[model samples]
Target: PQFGLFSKYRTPNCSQYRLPGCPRHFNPVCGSDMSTYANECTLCMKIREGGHNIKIIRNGPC
Candidate 1:
């Protein structure tokens, strides 16, 4: 099941939901899967499928 600020099933036709391209914001974050994302939006996209956990590790890269 999906869990987060955005709905995983809101997309039509059950197609993969695409994130609106974010700016070159360098707000680095860490995911429960032990991966680093460029930003919160990107991190959410990465963990959206498995209901994984994510949090900002720092303002810069981990």
Candidate 2:
């Protein structure tokens, strides 16, 4: 599991903190369930394949 370069910008001040990064796209909370994070799609795929285990169930629907 390789990761692309992580952006250095500060997380946005908003409660949700959705902001753009070096590549000019949104910054995702590292471990949050958002499309901007690198592992999000991969995690979702795994959950689907495994029939949504307990923790996976907390990940919410893709």
Candidate 3:
């Protein structure tokens, strides 16, 4: 279940879905899990790799 302030929402998966690679660059993104991800790419990687459903609550903010 989504634990966000609102329902969890992810921008539709693009080619990036099948291809998960997090390039390095500081672009903070607040997530639903009450933490900020390095970037949306890392967030998506976390969601796929070693974490649960953490949607982006805010873009480009810590």
Candidate 4:
């Protein structure tokens, strides 16, 4: 059921599952899906999840 890295492109759930790691630990209900939760949009989730890996910033404090 997993879409892999490209999961975001297809299923909304994939996007949500990606980053900030979804606030709710409960499995999505049949009708009430986690993806629908607007507070945690797909794009935001993607950024939260993949941001550090996709693009790394090396700003060390001196």
Please tell me which predicted candidate would have the highest lDDT against the true structure: 3
In model 2, what lDDT does residue 27 have? Answer: 27
Q: Indicate the worst ten consecutive residues by lDDT in candidate 3.
A: 11-20
> Model 4, which residues run further than 4 Å from truth?
1-39, 50-62
**TM-score sort, best first:** 3, 1, 2, 4
Tens-digit lDDT track of model 2 for 1-62: 12322433222222222234223333233323333332323333323342231122122233
Candidate 1: list runs displaced more than 4 Å.
1-19, 25-27, 38-41, 50-61
| Over 4 Å off, model 3 | 1-5, 9-21, 38-41
User: Tens digits of per-residue lDDT for model 1 on 1-62?
Assistant: 23442543222121323447545655354443555554435655544553444443332456
Q: lDDT value for candidate 3?
A: 0.54
Clashes of each: 0, 0, 0, 0
Shift in Å, residue 25, candidate 3: 2.9
Candidate 3 lDDT over residue span 1-62, tens digit each: 32434444653232343444555666467665666765446656666654566556665565
TM-scores of all predicted structures: 0.34, 0.19, 0.47, 0.17
Candidate 2: Cα lDDT at 14: 26
Q: For candidate 4, report its TM-score.
A: 0.17
Which candidate wins on TM-score? 3
Q: List model 4 lDDT by residue over 1-62, tens digit each.
A: 34443433332333334455446544222211222222243334433563211211111111
